[PDB]
Design a protein around this ligand. Structure first.
Ligand SMILES: [Mn+2]
Length: 264
């Protein structure tokens, strides 16, 4: 039985839905850990040695631990599952990694993983094909009605404002503008000042924080802007199993529900 190592929880869960136990799916950066300076352990090096295929996000998500994907099993490829996604920068240059926060992109993650699994394990091609379509449809069925509702928001109110720049791909997929306090979790006073200024200028009503960062900056910004704190979104990791976002589909569904419930 082949072993497919995903870099972090979101990719692991996508892969499990496509492979359904035809392969063993493992995860390096488990739910509740963050990729930036994640410390690869000895046990983790075992996962790496066992992998027949390594599935990474790219867009620099793994940059701090790519060096551990070395001395690999012969034949084992590293696949970037965001291939085909036009990157969105962190400036007016380095890429923002959060490409999974998008309905269009979910379909691209699935397709690239389907393709890689099929190349690895061609005897099960018909199964990966069916599974990939089923899962793509399940995501569409859950998430499209939330998009449809979001799209009714009056143009002046088409802003996604968060703490980390975690929704920039969602904004591009749905046709919203994004404002945030820092591009990636690991914090700048000028970026806070800008968001405050932009919220006042555009009468922006809500700002969110996220499940792996502090709510204090968002709350402070809300106070300074006479905006409201929108609460916590799940974006960078799956939740614990009894939390609200234990799968990728549940993560998209929770965060988009919370956004649409806010913005109406
Ligand atoms: Mn992040």
């Amino acid at each position: 039985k082949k072993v497919v190592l995903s870099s972090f929880s979101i990719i692991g869960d996508i892969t499990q839905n496509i492979a359904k136990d035809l392969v063993t799916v493992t995860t390096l950066v488990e739910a509740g850990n963050d990729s930036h300076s994640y410390q690869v352990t000895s046990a983790d090096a075992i996962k790496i040695q066992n992998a027949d295929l390594i599935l990474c996000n790219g867009l620099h998500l793994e940059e701090t631990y790519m060096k551990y994907f070395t001395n690999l099993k012969k034949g084992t490829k590293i696949i970037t599952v965001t291939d085909g996604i036009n990157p969105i920068g962190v400036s007016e240059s380095e890429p923002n990694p959060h490409a999974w926060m998008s309905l269009t992109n979910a379909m691209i993650y699935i397709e690239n993983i389907r393709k890689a699994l099929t190349a690895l394990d061609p005897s099960n091609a018909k199964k990966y094909e069916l599974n990939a379509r089923e899962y793509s449809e399940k995501i569409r069925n859950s998430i499209l009605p939330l998009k449809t509702r979001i799209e009714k928001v009056d143009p002046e109110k088409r802003w996604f404002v968060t703490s980390e720049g975690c929704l920039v791909y969602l904004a591009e997929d749905f046709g919203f503008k994004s404002l945030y306090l820092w591009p990636i979790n690991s914090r700048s006073p000028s970026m806070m000042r800008h968001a405050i200024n932009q919220m006042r200028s555009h009468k922006i009503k809500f700002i969110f924080s996220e499940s792996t960062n502090s709510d204090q900056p968002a709350k402070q910004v809300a106070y300074e802007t006479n905006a409201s704190y929108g609460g916590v979104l799940y974006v960078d990791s799956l939740s614990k199993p009894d939390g609200p976002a234990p799968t990728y589909l549940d993560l998209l569904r929770f965060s988009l529900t919370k956004i649409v419930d806010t913005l109406f």
